[PDB]
Amino acid sequence: NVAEAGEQFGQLGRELRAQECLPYAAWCQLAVARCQQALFHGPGEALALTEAARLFLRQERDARQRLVCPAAYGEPLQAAASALGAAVRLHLELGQPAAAAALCLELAAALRDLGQPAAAAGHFQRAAQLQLPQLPLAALQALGEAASCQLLARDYTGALAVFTRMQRLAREHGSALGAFSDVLVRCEVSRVLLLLLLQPPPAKLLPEHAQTLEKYSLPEELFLLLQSLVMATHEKDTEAIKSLQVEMWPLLTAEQNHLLHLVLQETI
Amino acid sequence: REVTLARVSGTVQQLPAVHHVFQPELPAEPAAYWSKLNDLFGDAALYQSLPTLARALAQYLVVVSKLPSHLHLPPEKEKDIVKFVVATLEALSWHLIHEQIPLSLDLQAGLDCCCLALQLPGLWSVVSSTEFVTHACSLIHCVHFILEAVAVQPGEQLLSNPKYITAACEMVAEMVESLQSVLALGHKRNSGVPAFLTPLLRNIIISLARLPLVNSYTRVPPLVWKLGWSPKPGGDFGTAFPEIPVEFLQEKEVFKEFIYRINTLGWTSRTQFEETWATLLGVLRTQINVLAVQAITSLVLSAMTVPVAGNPAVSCLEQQPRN
Amino acid sequence: VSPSAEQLVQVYELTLHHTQHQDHNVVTGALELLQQLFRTPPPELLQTLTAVGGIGQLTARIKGDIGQSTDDDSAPLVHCVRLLSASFLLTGGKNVLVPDRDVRVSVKALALSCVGAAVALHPESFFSKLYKVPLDTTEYPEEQYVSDILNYIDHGDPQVRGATAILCGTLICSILSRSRFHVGDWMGTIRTLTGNTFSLADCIPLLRKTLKDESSVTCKLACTAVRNCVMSLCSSSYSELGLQLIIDVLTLRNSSYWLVRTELLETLAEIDFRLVSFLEAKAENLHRGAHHYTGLLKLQERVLNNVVIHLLGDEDPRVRHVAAASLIRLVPKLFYKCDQGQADPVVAVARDQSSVYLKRIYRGYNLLPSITDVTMENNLSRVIAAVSHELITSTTRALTFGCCEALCLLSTAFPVCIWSLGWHCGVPPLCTVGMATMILTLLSSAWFPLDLSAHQDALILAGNLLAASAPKSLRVWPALGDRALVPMVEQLFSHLLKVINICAHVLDDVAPLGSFYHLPSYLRLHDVLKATHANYKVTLDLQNSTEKFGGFLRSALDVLSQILELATLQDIGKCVEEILGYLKSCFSREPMMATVCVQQLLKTLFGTPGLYHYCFMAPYTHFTQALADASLRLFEPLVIKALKQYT
Amino acid sequence: RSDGCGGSFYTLDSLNLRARSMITTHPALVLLWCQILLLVNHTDYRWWAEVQQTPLGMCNREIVRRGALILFCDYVCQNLHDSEHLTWLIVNHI
């Protein structure tokens, strides 16, 4: 009775995907989820909710990326958020947090793409807290994406907090091994750039910041140039910082180039 | 203000008399103009001078939009501010050619000054005229060169009449598809651009694609140029192509790219808005009806804007307080 | 008696004589014979053709004195390249093309492949003059060489402009391999011998011109040329041009033809990126290229993040299989910056070349102390972190569906029991359980088990990643001793029994611990396996490696064995009769790895560094240390079934 | 140091020509031959100038260059009573 009706809604959803409208095939996938909530299935209801989530996010990728609509105002963003909220609650009720973390990563990558980085920071930190008991390297990559989202949205102190958390969780699990050392290199560059951008008073300067600012005041070229740039911003010598930005530009990625541009800006 | 305008006018007086368009592919070949462009212009003191005045004009053209009537720019220094924008952006592209990155704080100052000189109505009326077409073309090449010096690694691309008029035009069309792909904050394609350029480069590509040289070509999707569509253009410029016929808009992806270009480009003098209104009524198998309805909503909201009303660059939608 | 050399020389002169017989089929037949006889040559014929006199020591359209293959002071391949070039694809007066009216296109294609293989055997024949005796200076003013073969890059259709690509690639590879990278001395001797003006550089953009071509056939053939050529270019004195060819191959990863992408990913699989990293360290104006790019040129994180792992999500399964094989061929060759082993890329090239030329528990796990390379663990950890990142953050079906295959082939290639500090991320913190929780949450879904060629790879890879914790953990399921590892294994164990349960109800035509009646996902598994078993029971094709019910049941018994290593008698003693029933019903389909499972179930019922260190100092200390040391009971019907199946 | 007996032996300069043809394709054997030619007191500045390049690039040859220099320094590390190779190796190789 209910399963044949769910197969009928699945055929309707596939016909509507062939017709390629997609606010209304997702309504059929929500109907499939409701039908498999009528009996007790588990992960299939989660599959129907996530397929509905894919369809609403594809509707807004058609309504804000391929067509930058001035009339677009986020109507299936909210339905995709409610559907993935129901799916994450279902995975936390059944007991598998890796799938719920994957859905939070997908929702936050979608909100990073649509031009809203704080809620991406958001669900990325949520997924990175959902992956710390089981998969810490995936948690470090989720926190790295959260930190990139916060450097997009201009929340630099949150980026300090996330970067120190990443370095601490990389030292607890790297004793490095591999990509934990890449996590450590990215953190040991970008925390120094963020401690030079906002210069903290010694009250709010945590002892980890004290240890790394004692360490500087990772390959040898960029380490030498970071020591020279800390020594140049403590002395406020602008021509040296200019001749360093000319020669640290190929060595850094674009987020570190933005942070080094901001350090060179707010000292002149 | 008087010191800024006098020193900008002096640096424009040091420029050569007859301007030739900048080409970063083959610069040294056509003339000995580049001897005069390396003698008085390759000096380290003059290049030390130019982005300081670019910072000056950047903050000045910020302040212009809320000043009293005494403090606006004179109509005589207007041509000189346009030529100075062209000269500084060529200085930026020239040091990208020869030495290193320019300073990467002079990129930001040069693009500040050029975006703000493209948003003002008098300076846009001066750039969009005929006598500075070469100048406008130079801006396009230089802007793309700067984007191509930062965004696109070697072995990649952005996306996956004289000669310079038909190359800058395709160049701007490539940059509009890059606004779709490369210059969207948070996209995975945007991992290379250092994000203090993407508001500046996004605004400068939107504001350069609305020129009367380039806009008529830029609204036409490339799926139309792939098909057999080629009339003879003319408006005393090289490229003044007629409007797109509705027979190609009965395909969907052509129509999706057309509504994309007409959303991000906005409009111009009002007759081009009635042209777009006539085409989007000529569109009105059921998917195209949905997309045409959404296009009509986006037009009617593009008439709703409280400044210039049809320019996504300068302007933004009117909102009213209910408190 | 083995066949002699004079019989093969008779074959050779036979099929040189039958290139000139007037026909369409006889010419192409002799050309395909000569092409394949130059591809895989017999060794005696090849040692006679490479020699100077050659055939003389064994015996004791063409309008000029080419000179037969009997005369001395010149190798016979020089005569054969002159003969085939003058007869099939060149007019002896000028760099002018023979038309398609006179000689057909496919004859020219087979002729170009013959000249390619003949230059790959003997390069100097490419620089020979086309006529030994000069040809009628009244009618033709200048005499030309065999380099107008390379004027067939512009000729009309594909498979001629693509064959000159592989001709130029074998020309460059055979010049750099013939003379041991001393190119100036070799060109000095040839320019003193013949008067042609042709360097290797004048062939490299032409090859590059075949990569940017319209047809997928020419890009395929030019890509095989780069696979033959770029290693000999990249370590020679022309390394800048080989690096530019690596860049231009990197532009080509996204064509719409699957052979182009597989051969692209097989060119980029054989590259040693320590040497490419050295060439990036030296280069200044190559990081720019065209359009004055400022910044670096990172080939390694773009050939491994934008090409290989990017083509693990490609839609064809063939491209995903070749992408997993290319990961296996690239993990040793990486050189990520600043290890605690190799420091410079010079140290890396030195340690590879010096390490080359100066010298019963189940398959899952190890108990040795396992002396282990450090840079290899670092590169393997980088690769598994990138592969796990494109497994967890996937938004498609193809990414997981090929990424579990990439993990399973890296697991069988680089075992988790040995390289456990490369596979490690997280679990038990410090003999590792790397990343197995995500994979056990993949198998519990109702989406991933329905297609078998990734499910069986996920079973093998989950069994490896859980059995890798053997020496540390062991001191319900009493032998485990690491309690956070107790549920995961239980999951697999129940899952495997339920999977084996389905296969019993597939092989015995029965309509429906391990029980799958009330789960609404394993009934879908039964429907999929029943359809595939119907397709096997209808079609008779015995010798297939890929069958997807033989391989699936093979994997579901192998991983059940490898898990039954860890168990005890108190854990299995309530479940032995059920496993023996599901193996008595499941013996006749696959008995080779169903007696492995009975063998393991019968075990556990009865108790059971800086370029001075690497080049000289370390092999010399091992050498002198060696010279210092040198001074001194329900099994019985299944056993009867196994005996009959033996006999 | 002794020449071959009228061409009846492999003399050192022909075998050194063969080893200089081995610079590119086999570096480790060349470095072992470098320490052998250091070990017998045969320090002829022609061969060391050719193997150290004493006033893109080829890859493998570079190894030999750095290798030879380290080994040559080890020779001057041991018997340094003569001031010849100190001044030669510090003037030219800086």
Q: What is the DSSP string of A180-216?
A: HHHHHHHHHHHHHHHHHHS---TTT--HHHHHHHHHH
Q: Which residue has the tokens 């800024």?
A: B4
Amino acid of residue A91: H
How far is it, in rounded angstroms, from Cα B217 to Cα B205? 14
Which residues have C-beta within 8 Å of that of residue C298, sequence separation ≥ 6? B153, C280
| Experimental approach | cryo-EM
Which residues have C-beta within 8 Å of that of residue A198, sequence separation ≥ 6? A156, A157, A160
What is the signed CA dihedral for C102, C104, C109, C113, rounded to 10 degrees? -60
Contact A96 C381 (CB under 8 A): no
Chains with at least 3 CB pairs less than 8 angstroms from chain D: C
Number of independent structural domains in chain A:
1
Q: What is the DSSP letter of D46?
A: H
Using an 8 Å CB-CB cutoff, list chain A residues near C381: 177-180
How far is it, in rounded angstroms, from Cα B162 to Cα D26? 57
- Is A99 at the interface with chain C, CB within 8 A? yes
How far is it, in rounded angstroms, from Cα B18 to Cα B30? 14
C446: left (phi over 0), alpha (psi -120 to 50) or beta: alpha
Q: CB-CB: which of B145, B150, B155 is closest to C248?
A: B155
How far are the Cα atoms of A72, A105, B151, B306 from residue C90, in angstroms, in the given order? 66, 63, 47, 74
* Closest C-alpha to C578, from C559, C596, C601, C554: C601
| Cα atoms found within 13 Å of the Cα of residue A240, Cβ hemisphere only | 13
How far is it, in rounded angstroms, from Cα B210 to Cα C145? 58
Amino acid of residue B204: I
Helix (H, G, I), strand (E, B) or coil at C500: helix
C-to-D residue pairs, Cβ atoms closer than 8 angstroms: 67
Chain C, nearest residue to B141 by Cα: C291
What is the signed CA dihedral for C351, C243, C399, C443, rounded to 10 degrees? -10
- Is D57 at the interface with chain C, CB within 8 A? yes
Q: Which residue has the tokens 């901001």?
A: A262
Chain B, nearest residue to A254 by Cα: B194
* Closest C-alpha to C203, from C220, C236, C226: C226
How far is it, in rounded angstroms, from Cα B295 to Cα B287? 12
* Closest C-alpha to C309, from C390, C367, C411, C228: C390
Chain C, nearest residue to D22 by Cα: C180
End-to-end CA distance of chain C: 38
Q: B305 forms bridges with which residues in the sheet?
A: B317
Q: Do B174 and B152 form a contact (C-beta atoms < 8 A)? A: no
What backbone torsions phi and psi does residue C297 show, to the nearest 5 degrees?
A: -130, 95
Q: Do C477 and C489 form a contact (C-beta atoms < 8 A)? A: yes
Angle (CA) C256-C257-C259 rounded to 5° is: 150
Q: Do A260 and A234 form a contact (C-beta atoms < 8 A)? A: no
Q: B317 forms bridges with which residues in the sheet?
A: B305
Which residues have C-beta within 8 Å of that of residue C625, sequence separation ≥ 6? none
Q: Do chains D and A touch (3 or more CB pairs under 8 A)?
A: no
What backbone torsions phi and psi does residue B317 show, to the nearest 5 degrees?
A: -65, 145
| Cα atoms found within 13 Å of the Cα of residue B52, Cβ hemisphere only | 10
Residues 260-299 of B with CB under 8 A from C: none
Neighbouring C-beta atoms of residue D71, cutoff 10 Å = 19
Instruction: Pick from A257, A263, A265, A266 the residue to mutate for testing the B interface (most B CBs within 10 Å).
Output: A257
Using an 8 Å CB-CB cutoff, list chain C residues near A179: 381-382, 385-386
Residues constituting chain A: 268
Q: What is the DSSP letter of C468?
A: T
Q: What is the CA radius of gyration of chain C?
A: 31
How far is it, in rounded angstroms, from Cα C463 to Cα C474? 16
- Is D58 at the interface with chain C, CB within 8 A? yes
Q: Which residue has the tokens 């910082």?
A: A241
Which residues have C-beta within 8 Å of that of residue A81, sequence separation ≥ 6? A107
- Reported for C475-484, long-range contacts at CB under 8 A and 24+ positions apart, including other chains, are C476/C571, C477/C566, C477/C567, C477/C568, C477/C571, C478/C568, C478/C570, C478/C571, C479/C566, C479/C567, C479/C568, C479/C571, C480/C566, C482/C428, C484/C427, C484/C428
Q: Which residue has the tokens 């949450």?
A: C441
Q: What is the DSSP letter of C394?
A: -
Q: C137 forms bridges with which residues in the sheet?
A: none
How far is it, in rounded angstroms, from Cα C161 to Cα C156? 8
How far are the Cα atoms of B86, B186, C288, C441, C618 from residue B148, in angstroms, in the given order? 18, 19, 11, 44, 49
How far is it, in rounded angstroms, from Cα C389 to Cα A142? 10
* Closest C-alpha to D52, from D14, D89, D25: D89
* Closest C-alpha to C71, from C85, C53, C98, C89: C53
Q: Which residue has the tokens 């095939």?
A: A25
How far are the Cα atoms of A19, B165, C417, C471, C474 from residue C369, in angstroms, in the given order? 61, 71, 11, 10, 16
Sign of the Cα torsion D5, D10, D11, D17 reads positive
Distance of CA A101 to the CA centre of its chain: 12
Contact D71 C616 (CB under 8 A): yes
Using an 8 Å CB-CB cutoff, list chain A residues near B104: 245-246, 249, 257, 261, 264
Contact C615 D62 (CB under 8 A): no
Using an 8 Å CB-CB cutoff, list chain A residues near C337: 219
C172: left (phi over 0), alpha (psi -120 to 50) or beta: alpha
A178: left (phi over 0), alpha (psi -120 to 50) or beta: left
- Is C388 at the interface with chain A, CB within 8 A? yes
Q: Where are the alpha helices (DSSP H) in C357-445?
A: 374-392, 397-413, 420-423, 436-442
Residues constituting chain C: 647
- The CA-based diameter of chain B, rounded to the nearest angstrom, is 65
B-to-C residue pairs, Cβ atoms closer than 8 angstroms: 40
- Is D69 at the interface with chain C, CB within 8 A? no
Contact B195 A253 (CB under 8 A): no
Chain C, nearest residue to D25 by Cα: C180
Using an 8 Å CB-CB cutoff, list chain C residues near B197: none
Which residues have C-beta within 8 Å of that of residue C539, sequence separation ≥ 6? none
End-to-end CA distance of chain D: 30
Q: Do C382 and C334 form a contact (C-beta atoms < 8 A)? A: yes
* Closest C-alpha to C122, from C86, C85, C174, C74: C174
Using an 8 Å CB-CB cutoff, list chain C residues near A141: 385, 389, 393
Distance from the C437 Cα atom to the nearest Cα atom in chain A, whole angstroms? 7
Quick one: chain C helix, strand, coil %, rounded to 5?
60, 0, 40
Structure-block tokens of residue B145: 């060169």
Residues constituting chain B: 323
Which residues have C-beta within 8 Å of that of residue C584, sequence separation ≥ 6? C637, C638, C641
- Is C382 at the interface with chain A, CB within 8 A? yes
Contact A41 C447 (CB under 8 A): no
Buried b (16+ CB within 10 A) or exposed e, B93-122: bbbbeeeebbbbbbbbbbbbbbbbbbbbee
Q: What is the DSSP letter of B310?
A: S
What backbone torsions phi and psi does residue A227 show, to the nearest 5 degrees?
A: -60, -40
Q: Do C93 and C144 form a contact (C-beta atoms < 8 A)? A: yes
Task: Cite the beta strand spans of chain B per DSSP E.
Answer: none
| Cα atoms found within 13 Å of the Cα of residue C459, Cβ hemisphere only | 28
Q: CB-CB: which of A19, A112, A268 is closest to B186?
A: A112
Distance from the B171 Cα atom to the nearest Cα atom in chain C, whole angstroms? 14
What is the signed CA dihedral for B205, B208, B210, B212, rounded to 10 degrees? -150
Q: Which residue has the tokens 């002799």?
A: C30
How far are the Cα atoms of A112, A255, B204, C301, C307 from residue B191, in angstroms, in the given order? 13, 8, 20, 13, 17
- Is C279 at the interface with chain D, CB within 8 A? yes
* Closest C-alpha to C458, from C446, C469, C444: C444
Is B268 exposed, middle or buried (CB count within 10 Å of its CB: 0-12, 13-18, 19+)? middle
Amino acid of residue B205: I
Amino acid of residue A61: R
How far is it, in rounded angstroms, from Cα C262 to Cα C321? 9
Q: Do A117 and B186 form a contact (C-beta atoms < 8 A)? A: yes
How far is it, in rounded angstroms, from Cα C628 to Cα A243? 57
Q: Which residue has the tokens 């129901």?
A: A86
Q: Which residue has the tokens 């696959």?
A: C590
Q: CB-CB: which of D21, D29, D59 is closest to C357?
A: D29
* Closest C-alpha to C166, from C125, C106, C206, C197: C206
Q: Do C159 and C167 form a contact (C-beta atoms < 8 A)? A: no
End-to-end CA distance of chain B: 39
Sign of the Cα torsion A203, A204, A207, A212 reads negative
What backbone torsions phi and psi does residue C643 show, to the nearest 5 degrees?
A: -70, -45
How far are the Cα atoms of A68, B73, B177, C192, D74 from residue B256, in angstroms, in the given order? 11, 42, 13, 65, 73
Contact C382 A178 (CB under 8 A): yes
Contact B105 A265 (CB under 8 A): yes
| Cα atoms found within 13 Å of the Cα of residue B186, Cβ hemisphere only | 21
How far is it, in rounded angstroms, from Cα A202 to Cα A214? 13
Domain that holds residue A189: 1-268
Contact A68 B193 (CB under 8 A): no
Please state at what angle helix A97-113 crosses helix A75-94, rounded to 10 degrees: 160
Q: What is the DSSP letter of B317?
A: B
How far is it, in rounded angstroms, from Cα C38 to Cα C16? 13
Which residues have C-beta within 8 Å of that of residue A75, sequence separation ≥ 6? none
How far is it, in rounded angstroms, from Cα C599 to Cα C605? 10
Contact B154 C293 (CB under 8 A): yes
How far is it, in rounded angstroms, from Cα A91 to Cα C476? 26
What backbone torsions phi and psi does residue B28 show, to the nearest 5 degrees?
A: -85, -10
* Breaks in chain D (C–N > 2.5 Å) following residue: 55
Q: C129 forms bridges with which residues in the sheet?
A: C145
Instruction: Pick from C292, C298, C307 the residue to mutate for testing the B interface (most B CBs within 10 Å).
Output: C292
Using an 8 Å CB-CB cutoff, list chain A residues near B194: 254-255, 257-258, 261
Using an 8 Å CB-CB cutoff, list chain C residues near D66: 346, 611
Q: Which residue has the tokens 């998917």?
A: B287
Q: Which residue has the tokens 């004048």?
A: C202
Q: What is the DSSP letter of C478?
A: T
Helix (H, G, I), strand (E, B) or coil at C145: strand
Q: CB-CB: which of B193, B260, B301 is closest to A68?
A: B260
How far is it, in rounded angstroms, from Cα C475 to Cα C485? 13
Using an 8 Å CB-CB cutoff, list chain A residues near C382: 178-179, 182
Contact A179 C382 (CB under 8 A): yes
Q: CB-CB: which of D24, D29, D62 is closest to C346?
A: D62
How far is it, in rounded angstroms, from Cα B202 to Cα B184? 8
Q: Which residue has the tokens 């396009």?
A: B140
How far are the Cα atoms of B96, B240, C129, C412 from residue C459, in angstroms, in the given order? 54, 64, 63, 12
B46: left (phi over 0), alpha (psi -120 to 50) or beta: alpha
Structure-block tokens of residue C595: 């007696």
Distance of CA C9 to the CA centre of its chain: 35
What backbone torsions phi and psi does residue C145 show, to the nearest 5 degrees?
A: -110, 180
Quick one: chain D helix, strand, coil %, rounded to 5?
65, 0, 35
Helix (H, G, I), strand (E, B) or coil at C491: helix
- Is B100 at the interface with chain A, CB within 8 A? yes
How far is it, in rounded angstroms, from Cα C272 to Cα C303? 12
Chain B, nearest residue to C288 by Cα: B154
Structure-block tokens of residue C53: 């006199």
Helix (H, G, I), strand (E, B) or coil at B11: helix
Helix (H, G, I), strand (E, B) or coil at C48: helix
How far are the Cα atoms of A164, A212, A227, C198, D88 from residue A196, in angstroms, in the given order? 15, 12, 12, 58, 48
Contact C294 B97 (CB under 8 A): no
- H or E element, residue C316: none
How far is it, in rounded angstroms, from Cα C208 to Cα C231? 16
